[PDB]
Symmetry: C3
Subunit: 135 residues, 3 copies
Amino acid sequence: SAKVAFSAIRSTNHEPSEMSNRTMIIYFDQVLVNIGNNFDSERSTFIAPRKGIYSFNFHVVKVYNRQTIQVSLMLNGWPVISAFAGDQDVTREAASNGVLIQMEKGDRAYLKLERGNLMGGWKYSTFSGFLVFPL
Amino acid sequence: SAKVAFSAIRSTNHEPSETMIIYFDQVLVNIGNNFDSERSTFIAPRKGIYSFNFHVVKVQTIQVSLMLNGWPVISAFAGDQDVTREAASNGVLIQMEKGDRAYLKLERGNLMGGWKYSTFSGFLVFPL
Amino acid sequence: GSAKVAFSAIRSTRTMIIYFDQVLVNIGNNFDSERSTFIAPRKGIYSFNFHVVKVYNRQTIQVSLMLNGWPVISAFAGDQDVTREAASNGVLIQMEKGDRAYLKLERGNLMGGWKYSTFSGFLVFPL
Ligand SMILES: *[C@@H]1O[C@H](CO)[C@@H](O)[C@H](O)[C@H]1NC(C)=O
């Protein structure tokens, strides 16, 4: 209803599943907040419970930054915003962006690795979201 | 009044138009219409705490300062190393009055090749 | 009233706790100790975001958001040659009354200082 919020973090440097390599969906294992449980089980897809304005924020951190990576915030399979990183030799680098989106009942919001790979594991990556107000 | 929010994106790599103000053509969210027509200015409709967030993406060292009534409040920097793209990002909460104007100014550098994928967001957290 | 909790601070000109002298917003006065410290007044979901600016070029820094002396999220800037690189991250947290949230310089020393570093947070909704 009025209180919907999720907060996830990848607490581990493990490689992606070969199921996750296909779908190109970035998943998060450690869930710090899930109010209304609309952020589902390690699929890392948010299901809008009702109509309203929602906030979204992500940071995709990588240990290996050789090849460029592009992360796109998806809405029902269509990209909304994008973040860019890679082509670096650094300690750790984050591809980060945030946006507010008007959602209708049942929309799906998730992160897709449009380009690059998650070799060496993404760790300390974050994905947050909450309902600002329903409309 | 109670529910105020905006959200905009630079959807094309087009060169800037003629004031040193970074505008965004694609508006996802505008609740209350307090974010003006295809430019960067948000006008506070009531006293309260407002959230603001911006990610200005480029393709030289540019400084983006979040302006409030003509003075800078926070600043972001994007030193151009050997990269395809780079973002100057920051965010803050500000206490604002009815009539205050928050917008993004490009203090240093220029945006050529476009500032595509740059975002700007903001909403009223609670009134006062 | 009790449902309105928000703070935001910048850094202008020990336990490795980063501080932000200029306080833009403090509603409820629950951010104190001349830094990014903040005690939750009530149980609920709180938002947090921070940008720690790596001023000097050749350094590497790591900033960890702390919850009662334990890291929750980490931000990284360094091993590069770019001036004023931001170690940034954000998270929502479930917290109870008395929980302390602050920023710790986990690795490195902010050289050239840190300036235009921001640290803000607010109560999304109580529980
Ligand atoms: C998924 O792709 C990454 C990057 O190539 C690889 O390291 C990982 O092993 C792949 N997953 C599986 C299950 O092989």
